[PDB]
């Protein structure tokens, strides 16, 4: 695809959200799209920046042998774009691959950086790399674009990106072997792939938390989620 300008004409330079395909996840379906690879080298991308979005993820995964399946921990700066909520998810199943590569072309991005591979810790909004822009639009368009978007940010991200959780439990891995318990305040609940996004779970942190709660301190709650319970 050389066209006339592919050779050296300037291109700029931000990540775009994959959710434009109507994509949403129950959590494991996101990992369904990635898994791990393979001893093939990792690749990275340099950006001017990337898109803010309501849905992103923080990760740590473990191996039963104590390795524990860690994704690489790169020396790149690890701040990331605002995201209304993120889901930290953690624990085994194991990484047979030596890294958590995307299968979708889903670059994982933070701090104007992205990669073909998921790294330990900081959030990975997923996306594709924009290329285009008049070379001088940087003094104009970029004032609202993510490079200066913090300048034009509203105060509503305080109700926005602030509203997040880290409590998912990734038991097992792959489509034939995993479960996602959700912790609250050392309480757990049966995974609900038929429900999405922690606002729902927040009700559990305001209702079943209010009653049907772990008044019994013998252990973390394991709420039994009956489909009737899910319904009501």
């Amino acid at each position, epitope marked *: 695809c050389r066209d006339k300008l592919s050779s050296t004409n300037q291109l700029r330079s931000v990540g775009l959200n994959l959710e434009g395909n109507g994509v949403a996840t129950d959590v494991p379906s996101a990992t369904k799209r990635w898994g791990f690879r393979s001893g093939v080298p990792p690749k990275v991308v340099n950006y001017e920046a990337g898109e803010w979005a309501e849905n992103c993820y923080n990760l740590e995964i473990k191996k*039963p*042998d104590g390795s524990e399946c860690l994704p690489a921990a790169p020396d790149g700066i690890r701040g990331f774009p605002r995201c209304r909520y993120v889901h930290k998810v953690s*624990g085994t199943g194991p990484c047979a691959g030596d890294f958590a590569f995307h299968k979708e072309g889903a670059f994982f991005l933070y701090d104007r950086l992205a990669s073909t591979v998921i790294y330990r810790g900081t959030t990975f909004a997923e996306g594709v790399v924009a290329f285009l822009i008049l070379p001088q639009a940087k003094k104009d368009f970029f004032s609202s674009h993510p490079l200066r978007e913090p300048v034009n940010a509203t105060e509503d991200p305080s109700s926005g990106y602030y509203s997040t959780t880290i409590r998912y439990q990734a038991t097992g891995f792959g489509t034939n072997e995993t*479960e996602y318990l959700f912790e609250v305040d050392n309480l757990t609940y049966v995974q609900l792939e038929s429900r999405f996004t922690p606002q729902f779970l927040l009700q559990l942190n305001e209702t079943i938390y209010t009653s049907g709660k772990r008044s019994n*301190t*013998t*252990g*973390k*709650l394991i709420w039994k989620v009956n489909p009737e319970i899910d319904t009501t």
Partner: antibody, heavy 121, light 107 residues
Framework: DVKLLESGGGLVQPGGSLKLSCAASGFSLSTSGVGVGWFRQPSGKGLEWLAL???????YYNPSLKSQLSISKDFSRNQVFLKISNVDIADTATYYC??????????????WGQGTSVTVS | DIVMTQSPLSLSTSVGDRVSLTCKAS??????VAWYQQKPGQSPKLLIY???NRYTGVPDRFTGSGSGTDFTLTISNMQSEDLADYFCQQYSSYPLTFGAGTKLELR
């Protein structure tokens, strides 16, 4: 029937260390089923240590005792370990770990396993 | 955090005596307790789920009773083979503790 198993073990010089351990034959160790109980001293006197072991959180029943102990586990094999150090001679026992299936939040961990013989000299 | 007591080890029985056991605690546990028994030379087995429910394979002589700082164990009848050291526990705090074991003499 899962067999809780015990290994250790045997004679230890006082002020020494021992990685005391157990295993669950025939068991699928997983986050399901919560966790495992931990060794209690059969010597008596009476009851001693239990551990609040959760698949994601080893917790200490009586943290003051951590000067001699710490806990870790293996999921590749159904195994759990105790990092005994600075041994007190008063603690010798055959030590029973136990793993009752949890009753959800009611983690009533009975189901005692095999004995071992911890001794010192 | 919480401490517990149990009726004394030295109790005496004869076959077919209905008996009961008690324990006490320094905190109102609600129903978060369990009872178990053990026989010498043997690993222990659990007896009472919660404040009253019983574990699988427990004899029909046994149910739990009470709440809070006071619990009991009802045992209908007696059999000499059923002697064991009996115990109870709060689950409301850590470290967890057991009441002193008790057993009854065949006298």
């Amino acid at each position: 029937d899962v067999k809780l198993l015990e290994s250790g073990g045997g004679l230890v010089q006082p002020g020494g260390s021992l990685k005391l351990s157990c295993a669950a034959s025939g068991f699928s160790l997983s986050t399901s089923g919560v966790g495992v109980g931990w060794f209690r001293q059969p010597s008596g006197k009476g009851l001693e240590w239990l551990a609040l072991i959760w698949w994601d959180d080893d917790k200490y029943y009586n943290p003051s005792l951590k000067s001699q102990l710490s806990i870790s586990k293996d999921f590749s094999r159904n195994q759990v370990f105790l990092k005994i150090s600075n041994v007190d001679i008063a603690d010798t026992a055959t030590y029973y770990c136990a793993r009752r299936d949890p009753f959800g939040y009611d983690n009533a961990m009975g189901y005692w396993g095999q004995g071992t013989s911890v001794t010192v000299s | 955090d919480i401490v517990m007591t149990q009726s004394p080890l030295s109790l005496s029985t004869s076959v077919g005596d209905r008996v009961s056991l008690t324990c006490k605690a320094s905190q109102n546990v609600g129903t978060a307790v369990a009872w178990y028994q053990q026989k010498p030379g043997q690993s222990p087995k659990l007896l009472i789920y919660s404040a009253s429910n019983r574990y699988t394979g427990v004899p029909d002589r046994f149910t739990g009773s009470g709440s809070g700082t006071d619990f009991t164990l009802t045992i209908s009848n007696m059999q000499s083979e059923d002697l064991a050291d009996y115990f109870c526990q709060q689950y409301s705090s850590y470290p967890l503790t057991f009441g002193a074991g008790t057993k009854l003499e065949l006298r």
